C-alpha cells in the first residue's frame, strides 16, 4: 500500500515506466496518499 | 444534483467549438496518451454496386421458391419487365383436376393487393358446371380472406378451393 | 508593420529589427531598455495570442525537446534550425510578444506548471543557443547538456503542415475517377468536422468563413492564393 | 536520441524499456546470491521495493529515539551504542549494509558478520528485522556467538550438523502472550534473545536471558536437557560465560 | 506506514465525501474555465479570476479513486482469504497443536502436489 511505480505500454513493441506520485506536477503537491519517491527507481530501471 | 456544469457547458452551443480542445486534451494527455487507437489498416469505401438488375425486392421471390412443388410458377410476357415484375402463372399439379392458371398481378411489397383479375374469366369459366363452382368457392374464399397476402394466401387459398370442388 | 503607434526618430519595426545589440537573458530589461509605451494599439488585440500565436511559443517549445536527436536515424531528424538570422528573428518576435503580454495578461504561457513566468527561461535558452550558433558556432557546449532537461510544461500534437505526391518513378500509375489508391492556424481544427472548411494542399488546412468578429486581417490577407496556394480545394465531411 | 542520462536527476518522467521479462518472474538468484540461504524465488522489482522499504524504516527508527548522523556524501544511519556507520550499496539492487567499523577485535570475522546482516534483510518478508538489527548492539564479543552460529549454520564449514539456527523473531514455541511484532530484546537486567531454533530432519525454539550486569529453560525433552546441560557446565566464569555455554547447549546438549 | 485500524468499511465511507466534494469541485472549476475561454474567444477582458488549472484538481481525484480502488481491492482480498480459509481450513488458532497445523498444511500441500502430478502425466500420455 505504499511506493507504487506506474509501468505501462503504449508503443509496438516498448513499455514505459514513471513515478505514480508527481501526477504531471514535478515537486509542487502529492497525490494525497502513499509516501512518493521511495530510494531511486530510476536508475534501478536504466541498469537493466 | 450538481447540473451547476450542465447550462455552462451547454453555453458553447455556436459554431465557434474549437478552445474545448485546450480545455481538455493536455489533462487529457496527462492521463491517456494513447497513439494506439486504431493503428490498423482502415479506409471508407462508401459503395461499388447496388442495384437488382434482375427482379422487384428479392424478398417476393425468395419466399415463393419455398413454396411446395405441387406449385408451378412461371411468367407470361414482360409487360412489367422491371418495376412490376409480377404476373404470374401456376399450374396445380397434385392429385385433383386441373384448371387454368390465374391472373396474380402484385403492387409494391407493402402488399395491399388483390392479385388475380382473371383476365380469362368469362370464357373459360363458361365452360363446364364444375369449374364454374370451382370459380364460385374460390371468390366466395377470396372475399373471406381479410387484407388477403399475394405471396402465400393466393396461392393456398386456390389450392384450397381447388381440394373443395369434389363436394 | 500592424502598429498605430505614435511616430519616433526610426520607423517602429525598423527601431526594433535592431534588438540583436542586446544582452543574452532578462528580455524584460532589453524591452524597457529599447521601448516600452509605443507598441500597444487598442484593446480588441485579445484575439490572437491566445488563439493563433501560441503556436510560436509551442513552436520553440517543439525546438527545446528535439534539440538532442542527432543520435535519430535522421541527421536533421525532424529540423535543425541553426540558421541563426532567422532565429534571431524568432528572438524578437519573442521579445515583442512579451511585451504584448506585458500589455495584457490573454498571453500565451506554458500551461502547465512553473509559473510564479516560465516564458523568461524559455527566452533565456534560447537565446543562449542562439549566441553559441550565431556567427559559425558548435553544436551536438556544455550548456547543451542542461537545457536539454525536459521541463514539464513541453506540449505535443502539432500539424507540421504537409502533403503527399505522384511518384509515378518509370513504368504505370493506374486510377480511377475517385477513391484515390495510397502512394492559417487560427484554430479551426477540431477532431470532426464542423463548417463547410474551405482547405488549401500546401499547408493550410483551414476555415471557409474565418468565424471571427474582427480578426480580418488574417482572413482578408488569405482569402486569395496562399503561400503556392493554387490547390485551394474543398470536400464536405463524412457522413455515418 | 534517447539516452539523455549523461548527468543525474532528481526526478522520473517516462522512462522508456524483454526487460519487463528479465525484471518479472522472479529468479532464485537475488542479485549476487552467494548461496548462503533462501529456497524462494525472488524478484528484483520485489527485492528492490524490500530494500528500499527497509532503509525507510531504519531511517524512521534510528530518527525517532537514537542519535543519527546528519545528510552528507553518505548516509550513515548505524550510529550505534559506541560507533558504527554502515549504509552503502554499492549494488543497490541486492542491499543496503556493509562493516560498520573495527577499533579492537571481538578480523575475517568482521566481514563474516557484516555479510550475514546483509544476508539477513533478504526479502522484505518481515521489518520487524530492522528492531532486531537495532538491539544487536553486544560489543564484548556477545554478538560474536550467534554470528559464528548463523555462519556455520549458513555455510557448513569443517544439533550435531542438524537445523540449529534462530536470527528471526516471534518464535512459535515461545509463552503464549500474544501475537508478537518485534521482540528483539528484553531491556532488564537479564537480557532476552532466542538462543536457537532446533529441528530433526521435530521441531522447537530455545530463547536465552543473558545476565548483563537468569536463563530458565517437546517441553519434557527440551527443558530438563537444557536445564541439565547449563547445570552441567556450570564452571564457565576473562570472558567465561561468553560462548562455551552457547556451544555445549547446541551440541553437547546430546 | 498508515495505521488507520486496518478496517475499510468506515475508510471507505468517511472517504465518499471527499469523491463527491472532488467531483463538484472539478465541475465547477471546469465551467469556470469554460466561460473564460468563450469570453475570451469572442467576448472582452472580462475573464479576470485566477482559477486552478484543472489539471491538479483533476489528476488528485484519480488519485484519490485510485487509492480507494486499491483499498477496497485489498478488503476483497481479506474476505475471499477469510471465506476459503473458513471453507476449508478449521478453527485452530490459541484445538490443535500450531505443529500438527502446519504438519497437516504440509500434507494437503503435498496431496495437491501428487494430484497436480498426476493430471499432468495425464496430459502428456493423452498427447
Known amino acids: 500500500n505504499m511506493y507504487c511505480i506506474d509501468i505501462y505500454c503504449r508503443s509496438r513493441g516498448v513499455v514505459a515506466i514513471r513515478d505514480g506520485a508527481y501526477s504531471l506536477f514535478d515537486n509542487s503537491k502529492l497525490v494525497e496518499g502513499f509516501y512518493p519517491a521511495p530510494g531511486l527507481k530510476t536508475f534501478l530501471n536504466m541498469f537493466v | 444534483q450538481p447540473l451547476l456544469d450542465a447550462v455552462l457547458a451547454n453555453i458553447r452551443s455556436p459554431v465557434f467549438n474549437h478552445s474545448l480542445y485546450r480545455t481538455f486534451v493536455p489533462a487529457m494527455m496527462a492521463i491517456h496518451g494513447p497513439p494506439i487507437v486504431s493503428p490498423v489498416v482502415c479506409s471508407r469505401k462508401r459503395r461499388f454496386e447496388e442495384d437488382e438488375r434482375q427482379s422487384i425486392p428479392n424478398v417476393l421471390q425468395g419466399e415463393v421458391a419455398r413454396l411446395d412443388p405441387k406449385?408451378?410458377?412461371?411468367?407470361?410476357?414482360?409487360?412489367?419487365?422491371?418495376?412490376?415484375?409480377?404476373?404470374?402463372?401456376?399450374?396445380?399439379?397434385?392429385?385433383?383436376?386441373?384448371?387454368?392458371?390465374?391472373?396474380?398481378?402484385?403492387?409494391?411489397?407493402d402488399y395491399p393487393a388483390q392479385s388475380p383479375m382473371w383476365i380469362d374469366r368469362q370464357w373459360q369459366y363458361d365452360a363446364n358446371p364444375f369449374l364454374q363452382s370451382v370459380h364460385r368457392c374460390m371468390t366466395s374464399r377470396l372475399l373471406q380472406l381479410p387484407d388477403k397476402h399475394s405471396v402465400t394466401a393466393l396461392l393456398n387459398t386456390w389450392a384450397q378451393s381447388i381440394h373443395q370442388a369434389c363436394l | 508593420p500592424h502598429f498605430l503607434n505614435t511616430p519616433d526618430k526610426s520607423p517602429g519595426d525598423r527601431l526594433a529589427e535592431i534588438c540583436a545589440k542586446i544582452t543574452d537573458v532578462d528580455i524584460d530589461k532589453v524591452m524597457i531598455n529599447l521601448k516600452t509605451e509605443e507598441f500597444v494599439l487598442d484593446m480588441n488585440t485579445l484575439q490572437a495570442l491566445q488563439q493563433l500565436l501560441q503556436w510560436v511559443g509551442d513552436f520553440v517549445l517543439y525546438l527545446l525537446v528535439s534539440l538532442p536527436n542527432q543520435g535519430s536515424p535522421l541527421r536533421p531528424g525532424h529540423s535543425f534550425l541553426r540558421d541563426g538570422t532567422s532565429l534571431g528573428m524568432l528572438r524578437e518576435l519573442m521579445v515583442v510578444i512579451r511585451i504584448w503580454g506585458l500589455l495584457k495578461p490573454s498571453?500565451?504561457?506554458?500551461?502547465?506548471?512553473?509559473?510564479?513566468?516560465?516564458?523568461?527561461?524559455?527566452?533565456?535558452?534560447?537565446?543562449?543557443?542562439?549566441?553559441?550558433?550565431?556567427?559559425?558556432?558548435?553544436?551536438?557546449?556544455?550548456?547543451?547538456?542542461?537545457?536539454?532537461?525536459?521541463?514539464?510544461?513541453?506540449?505535443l500534437r502539432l500539424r507540421f503542415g504537409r502533403a503527399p505526391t505522384l511518384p509515378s518513378s518509370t513504368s504505370t500509375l493506374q486510377l480511377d475517377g475517385l477513391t484515390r489508391a495510397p502512394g492559417l492556424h487560427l484554430g479551426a481544427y477540431p477532431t470532426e468536422e464542423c463548417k463547410a472548411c474551405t482547405r488549401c494542399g500546401c499547408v493550410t488546412m483551414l476555415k471557409s468563413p474565418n468565424k471571427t468578429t474582427a480578426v480580418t486581417q488574417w482572413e482578408q490577407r488569405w482569402i486569395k492564393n496562399c503561400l503556392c496556394g493554387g490547390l485551394w480545394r474543398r470536400v464536405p465531411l463524412s457522413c455515418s | 536520441p534517447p539516452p539523455r542520462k549523461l548527468p543525474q536527476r532528481s526526478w522520473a518522467a517516462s522512462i522508456p524499456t524483454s526487460a519487463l521479462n528479465i525484471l518479472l518472474l522472479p529468479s532464485p538468484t537475488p542479485g549476487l546470491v552467494p548461496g548462503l540461504a533462501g529456497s524462494y524465488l525472488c524478484s528484483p522489482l520485489?527485492?528492490?521495493?524490500?530494500?528500499?522499504?527497509?532503509?525507510?524504516?531504519?531511517?524512521?527508527?534510528?530518527?525517532?529515539?537514537?542519535?543519527?548522523?546528519?545528510?552528507?556524501?553518505?548516509?550513515?544511519?548505524?550510529?550505534?551504542?559506541?560507533?558504527?556507520?554502515?549504509?552503502?550499496?554499492?549494488?543497490?539492487?541486492?542491499?543496503?549494509?556493509?562493516?560498520?567499523?573495527?577499533?579492537?577485535?571481538?578480523?575475517?570475522?568482521?566481514?563474516?558478520?557484516?555479510?550475514?546482516?546483509?544476508?539477513?534483510?533478504?526479502?522484505?518478508?518481515?521489518?520487524?528485522?530492522?528492531?532486531?538489527?537495532?538491539?544487536?548492539?553486544?560489543?564484548?564479543?556477545?554478538?560474536?556467538?550467534?554470528?559464528?552460529?548463523?555462519?556455520?549454520?549458513?555455510?557448513?564449514?569443517?544439533?550435531?550438523?542438524?537445523?540449529?539456527?534462530?536470527?528471526?523473531?516471534?518464535?512459535?514455541?515461545?509463552?503464549?502472550?500474544?501475537?508478537?511484532?518485534?521482540?528483539?530484546?528484553?531491556?532488564?537486567?537479564?537480557?532476552?534473545?532466542?538462543?536457537?531454533?532446533?529441528?530433526?530432519?521435530?521441531?522447537?525454539?530455545?530463547?536465552?536471558?543473558?545476565?548483563?550486569?537468569?536463563?530458565?529453560?517437546?517441553?519434557?525433552?527440551?527443558?530438563?536437557?537444557?536445564?541439565?546441560?547449563?547445570?552441567?557446565?556450570?564452571?564457565?566464569?576473562?570472558?567465561?560465560?561468553?560462548?562455551?555455554?552457547?556451544?555445549?547447549?547446541?551440541?553437547?546438549?546430546? | 506506514q498508515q495505521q488507520q485500524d486496518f478496517d475499510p468499511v468506515q475508510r471507505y465511507k468517511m472517504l465518499?465525501?471527499?469523491?463527491?466534494?472532488?467531483?463538484?469541485?472539478?465541475?465547477?472549476?471546469?465551467?469556470?474555465?469554460?466561460?473564460?475561454?468563450?469570453?475570451?474567444?469572442?467576448?472582452?477582458?472580462?475573464?479576470?479570476?485566477?482559477?486552478?488549472?484543472?489539471?491538479?484538481?483533476?489528476?488528485?481525484?484519480?488519485?484519490?479513486?485510485?487509492?480507494?480502488?486499491?483499498?477496497?481491492?485489498?478488503?476483497?482480498?481479506?474476505?475471499?482469504?477469510?471465506?476459503?480459509?473458513?471453507?476449508?481450513?478449521?478453527?485452530?488458532?490459541?484445538?490443535?497443536?500450531?505443529?500438527?497445523?502446519?504438519?497437516?498444511?504440509?500434507?494437503?500441500?503435498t496431496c495437491a502436489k501428487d494430484i497436480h502430478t498426476a493430471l499432468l502425466d495425464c496430459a502428456n500420455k493423452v498427447t
Not at chain 4, 570472558?239 to 556451544?247: K, W
Open chain 2, 71 to 109: 406449385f408451378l410458377v412461371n411468367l407470361d410476357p414482360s409487360h412489367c419487365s422491371n418495376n412490376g415484375t409480377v404476373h404470374l402463372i401456376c399450374k396445380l399439379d397434385d392429385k385433383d383436376l386441373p384448371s387454368v392458371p390465374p391472373l396474380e398481378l402484385s403492387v409494391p411489397a
Open chain 3, 107 to 155: 498571453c500565451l504561457p506554458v500551461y502547465t506548471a512553473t509559473s510564479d513566468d516560465s516564458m523568461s527561461l524559455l527566452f533565456r535558452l534560447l537565446t543562449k543557443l542562439w549566441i553559441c550558433c550565431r556567427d559559425e558556432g558548435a553544436a551536438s557546449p556544455a550548456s547543451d547538456g542542461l537545457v536539454s532537461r525536459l521541463q514539464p510544461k513541453q506540449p
Open chain 4, 46 to 254: 520485489e527485492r528492490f521495493l524490500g530494500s528500499v522499504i527497509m532503509r525507510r524504516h531504519l531511517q524512521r527508527i534510528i530518527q525517532q529515539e537514537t542519535l543519527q548522523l546528519i545528510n552528507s556524501n553518505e548516509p550513515g544511519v548505524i550510529m550505534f551504542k559506541t560507533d558504527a556507520l554502515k549504509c552503502r550499496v554499492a549494488l543497490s539492487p541486492k542491499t543496503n549494509q556493509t562493516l560498520q567499523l573495527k577499533v579492537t577485535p571481538e578480523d575475517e570475522l568482521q566481514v563474516l558478520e557484516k555479510f550475514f546482516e546483509t544476508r539477513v534483510a533478504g526479502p522484505p518478508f518481515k521489518a520487524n528485522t530492522l528492531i532486531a538489527f537495532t538491539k544487536l548492539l553486544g560489543a564484548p564479543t556477545h554478538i560474536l556467538r550467534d554470528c559464528v552460529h548463523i555462519m556455520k549454520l549458513e555455510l557448513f564449514p569443517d544439533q550435531l550438523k542438524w537445523n540449529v539456527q534462530f536470527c528471526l523473531t516471534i518464535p512459535p514455541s515461545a509463552p503464549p502472550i500474544a501475537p508478537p511484532g518485534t521482540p528483539a530484546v528484553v531491556l532488564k537486567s537479564k537480557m532476552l534473545f532466542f538462543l536457537q531454533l532446533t529441528q530433526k530432519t521435530v521441531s522447537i525454539i530455545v530463547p536465552i536471558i543473558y545476565d548483563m550486569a537468569t536463563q530458565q529453560a517437546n517441553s519434557s525433552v527440551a527443558a530438563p536437557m537444557m536445564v541439565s546441560n547449563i547445570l552441567k557446565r556450570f564452571a564457565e566464569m576473562r570472558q567465561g560465560e561468553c560462548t562455551i555455554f552457547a556451544a555445549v547447549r547446541d551440541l553437547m546438549a546430546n
Open chain 5, 16 to 109: 465518499i465525501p471527499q469523491l463527491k466534494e472532488s467531483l463538484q469541485t472539478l465541475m465547477k472549476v471546469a465551467a469556470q474555465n469554460l466561460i473564460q475561454n468563450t469570453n475570451i474567444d469572442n467576448g472582452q477582458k472580462s475573464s479576470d479570476a485566477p482559477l486552478q488549472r484543472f489539471d491538479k484538481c483533476l489528476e488528485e481525484f484519480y488519485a484519490l479513486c485510485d487509492q480507494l480502488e486499491l483499498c477496497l481491492r485489498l478488503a476483497h482480498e481479506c474476505l475471499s482469504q477469510s471465506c476459503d480459509s473458513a471453507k476449508h481450513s478449521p478453527t485452530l488458532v490459541p484445538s490443535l497443536p500450531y505443529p500438527q497445523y502446519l504438519a497437516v498444511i504440509k500434507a494437503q500441500i
